Design a protein around this ligand. Sequence first.
Ligand SMILES: Cn1cc(C(=O)Nc2ccccc2)c2ccccc21
Ligand SMILES: Cn1cc(C(=O)Nc2ccccc2)c2ccccc21
Lengths: 247, 241, 248, 240
Amino acid sequence: LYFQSMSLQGKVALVTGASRGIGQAIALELGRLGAVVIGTATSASGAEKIAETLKANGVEGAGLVLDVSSDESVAATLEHIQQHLGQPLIVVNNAGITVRMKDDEWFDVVNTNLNSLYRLSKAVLRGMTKARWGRIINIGSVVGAMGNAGQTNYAAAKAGLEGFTRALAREVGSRAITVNAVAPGFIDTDMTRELPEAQREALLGQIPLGRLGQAEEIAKVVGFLASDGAAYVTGATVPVNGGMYMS
Amino acid sequence: QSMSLQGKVALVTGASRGIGQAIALELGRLGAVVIGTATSASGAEKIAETLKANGVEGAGLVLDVSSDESVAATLEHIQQHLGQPLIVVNNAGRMKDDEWFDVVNTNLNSLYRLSKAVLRGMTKARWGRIINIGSVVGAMGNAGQTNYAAAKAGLEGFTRALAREVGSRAITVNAVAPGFIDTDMTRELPEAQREALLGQIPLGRLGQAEEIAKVVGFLASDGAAYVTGATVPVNGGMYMS
Amino acid sequence: HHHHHSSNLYFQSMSLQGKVALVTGASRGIGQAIALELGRLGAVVIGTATSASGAEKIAETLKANGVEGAGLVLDVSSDESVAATLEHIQQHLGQPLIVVNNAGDEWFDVVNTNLNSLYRLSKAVLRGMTKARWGRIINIGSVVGAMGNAGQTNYAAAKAGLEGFTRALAREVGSRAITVNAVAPGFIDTDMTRELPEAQREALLGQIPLGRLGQAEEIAKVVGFLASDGAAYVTGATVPVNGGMYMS
Amino acid sequence: NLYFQSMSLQGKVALVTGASRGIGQAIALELGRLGAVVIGTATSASGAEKIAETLKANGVEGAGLVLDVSSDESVAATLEHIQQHLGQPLIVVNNAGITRDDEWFDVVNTNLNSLYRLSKAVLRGMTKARWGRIINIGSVVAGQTNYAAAKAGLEGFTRALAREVGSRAITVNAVAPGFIDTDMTRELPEAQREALLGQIPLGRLGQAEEIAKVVGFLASDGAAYVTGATVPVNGGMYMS
Ligand SMILES: Cn1cc(C(=O)Nc2ccccc2)c2ccccc21
Ligand SMILES: Cn1cc(C(=O)Nc2ccccc2)c2ccccc21
């Protein structure tokens, strides 16, 4: 057998929302570390793009279609993964939010997200319980709109993510399964490049590092949490925001 | 890897035993040149021997973080003989019910003093990593919970404030808050106290010194460059404050 | 089976000027005490329970303490129950401008069900508060709730949800001069906690700096303050009322 | 019975530091209104005089004294003078700030040393009476850094002291104001003011009196199970 810091050789990782941005970068980073990676999207064209992306970077795995809002989609996708690859022991929940946004959208957004986390988490626990090992990692939503509406939704989503992460970690810990979260700040993605320049330039002034974070910078934190060295880290939400904190 | 610290000098205080030692070895494993410190000459010597015995380049020196003179002189010695430390880990630190105030105040004064003195070099290089290690859980009574919570709160606020001050310079400042770790202090707490702490830990075990160190090594890496002002708890799911 | 039961001295505590307050889960403990304290402060109080016999007990309790108001049946998990009860209250007493939500594997569903209840009831009373350009919504957390190990998970989760929810709703409705706050009780003196054996009780007390259980009345005074004009700049806050015992 | 309970402060001596203007003044008047005998303090003789005049003009019994909370000598002597002439202060509100002009660290360190000094000195009297209220007022809203740091220290300190003294039926709490209408905030340019307002859900500045009502509640018998808490009074604007 092998035994190395940071290596995920021989593990199957499931990464939801893997077709663009943060999710893509997470998939490639777990690939780089030796995991067999199943990335998912909500559509066939995204699943295809994921597979192509993985192949082009020499990562074994697949792209599949998964709707985390559906008990059926989740059970079937898991069974398919079990049949063809094995039990995913590393699961990164990144699949999230589907006029501009307002300060009254928080409730639904957060409720729908945590129902999805719970559903998928619950379904992969059986396999992690059997192996007496696991990593669940929840990715929070990026800071996405500049005003009060945007600050409200972001803070609410971060708060739910934290409480949920901490509670699940407490339930499953006795089985040597860690549950953590990563809370990104202002990241360079498709959403943030197409904010108007006034809203965007205002955000830089609130960030001590004086830059946007990169998708890869979220992914390195996730890859660490997945490793054997982060085994005593559980129930934590690691903020990755260049020093700007808004709750 | 990209976890690599090849070509960097790291200073790790309180490096002669437990968590500090394990931090020194882990930064060594990652390729840093490591200066570990203790409060006595024999500890400095033990550090050097420990580093040699694990194939890590660096040294052991004597440092009293409570003293402005000790700090200035040690830094100047490090500057003369090996270069500017761009990774600095502050680890050097029954209980009493009124001891909290002085304990915390003394710790944060030590953090500030040492941090301030190494900033000049990090500012020049336009790069740095400062990592603050909180106190391990173990203290017996209500007194012990009080001191732990107070020390964690101070550590967090301090870490966050310093991170804001120095961030424009691409220096990150973070903290690691250990829970119940297997060390010299904990390995013979009475069994009732130990069992009680286990029962509050979801993972159902003590953490290892190495498990704190891996977190520190990650924070020091280029891949943790957007993490700053954070206190990362490393406690197996046991949260108390 | 009746589901609506109603009930020249001028006490100086009466600064609530006949305002109508709705207090869910008002038949026992903390909820009862909140109902009486808002009564003492001069509000017209509608306390609710899930059954007709509870609604009756509420009305009897209010009458026996000289508080105007009623006991009604309300199921906060039901859109129909909430819409109908509110309309009944509107028709017979007026718009409730003070609303205290106290009616409350396991960990997940408990918190999710609770916050859905808070949201439902809160959303339904907002129209009337918006019209009056004044309101107070106060959310009562899970009493401990959780004693040793497995329970504490449920308590911390419920507190985290309560706090984030409270803070978000407060941001949404603030421009209308409606405050939204929460009160997070620690270990409160009830039937359950009095009948613990002395060893278990002494151990619990040793975790509480004040060295005693809190009283129901002591939660209620906080709620009554938050409902007042003087707490008008307090919004989005969760006020812990736990004698110094903080469980993270 | 139900109706006559009151959480008035009749028969208690309250000490309020920094009482000559704004928040501190309004605290002094609110504890006066509630029936306490109030000693307000300032760092100068002219402030102590203004305090006494203010109290007299609102029919509140008490005094204005000079107190420098950064000085062990000033604290001991003032307390002894209060003990001799009025009685043991059992309600103590720490509102007096201290400036250093690396600011972030020294400001917070100087403040908490003040809180600790004064708190320690008034504990003997509260211990003797087996009753007390200590209330710590945070700073009103680089600037975000100093505010967050000062708030974090205030919280941890408040919580630790509360644990130490609780067995004696003394509560220790804090009030963290957001953007309040005071002398400092009445001179902001409109762009900076509008920006702050747009971050405040209530859409207005808080009043001094609104901080004071929270303090007066915490001082009452009905807040007796509230300890170790920091109550934010910021109209829904939370800076972490
Ligand atoms: C709908 N919703 C759920 C929130 C939430 O935090 N839920 C939660 C917490 C802990 C454990 C399990 C669930 C939550 C938080 C803020 C706003 C809305 C929320
Ligand atoms: C003496 N003391 C200082 C505490 C503390 O929080 N200091 C601090 C905070 C932020 C920045 C700089 C300094 C602190 C916290 C809890 C208990 C005691 C404390």
